[PDB]
């Protein structure tokens, strides 16, 4: 038979959301500080580009990436959530964060480049944590 299953082909799934009108949303000073301060500096290291979006598995050659995290979030979503207003309080943005620096921890092992990258980015992370308003 001459069907070899060289398609259909793997893709990405569709990235976390970004917008809900229906989601209950408020700006606080714990947000503000939140996008201002810590998403901002976090963005501005230089190994916040592992996570400056969400990853992408075709892209970086990781098919087994979605059959492990189940759960994807990464700091352009976080930022893109930020930005318009997505959250209700800062529990919900830091709990992307923490599903972020887990992910990484779960796929990856110790020592390798990117746990490295994340255990730096979720030192600073709580650093900035420990002067929320
Ligand atoms: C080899 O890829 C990387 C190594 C160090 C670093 Br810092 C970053 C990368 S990467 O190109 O961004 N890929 C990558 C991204 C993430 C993110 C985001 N979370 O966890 C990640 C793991 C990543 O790469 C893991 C890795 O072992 N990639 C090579 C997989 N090879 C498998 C067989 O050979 C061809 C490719």
Same mark, same amino acid.
């Given at each position: 038979?001459?069907?070899?299953?060289?398609?259909?082909?793997?893709?990405?799934?569709?990235?976390?959301?970004?917008?809900?009108?229906?989601?209950?949303?408020?700006?606080?000073?714990?947000?503000?500080?939140?996008?201002?301060?810590?998403?901002?500096?976090?963005?501005?290291?230089?190994?916040?580009?592992?996570?400056?979006?969400?990853?992408? &598995?075709?892209? !970086?050659?990781?098919?087994?990436?979605? $059959? #492990?995290?189940?759960? %994807?979030?990464?700091?352009?979503?976080?930022?893109?959530?930020?930005?318009?207003?997505?959250?209700?309080?800062?529990?919900?943005?830091?709990?992307?964060?923490?599903?972020?620096?887990?992910?990484?921890?779960?796929?990856?092992?110790?020592?390798?480049?990117?746990?490295?990258? &994340?255990?730096? !980015?979720?030192?600073?992370?709580?650093? $900035? #944590?420990?002067?929320? %308003?």
């Amino acid at each position: 038979h001459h069907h070899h299953h060289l398609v259909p082909r793997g893709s990405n799934p569709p990235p976390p959301e970004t917008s809900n009108p229906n989601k209950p949303k408020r700006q606080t000073n714990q947000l503000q500080y939140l996008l201002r301060v810590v998403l901002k500096t976090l963005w501005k290291h230089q190994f916040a580009w592992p996570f400056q979006q969400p990853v992408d &598995a075709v892209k !970086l050659n990781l098919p087994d990436y979605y $059959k #492990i995290i189940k759960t %994807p979030m990464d700091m352009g979503t976080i930022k893109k959530r930020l930005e318009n207003n997505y959250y209700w309080n800062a529990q919900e943005c830091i709990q992307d964060f923490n599903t972020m620096f887990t992910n990484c921890y779960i796929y990856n092992k110790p020592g390798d480049d990117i746990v490295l990258m &994340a255990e730096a !980015l979720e030192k600073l992370f709580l650093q $900035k #944590i420990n002067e929320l %308003p």
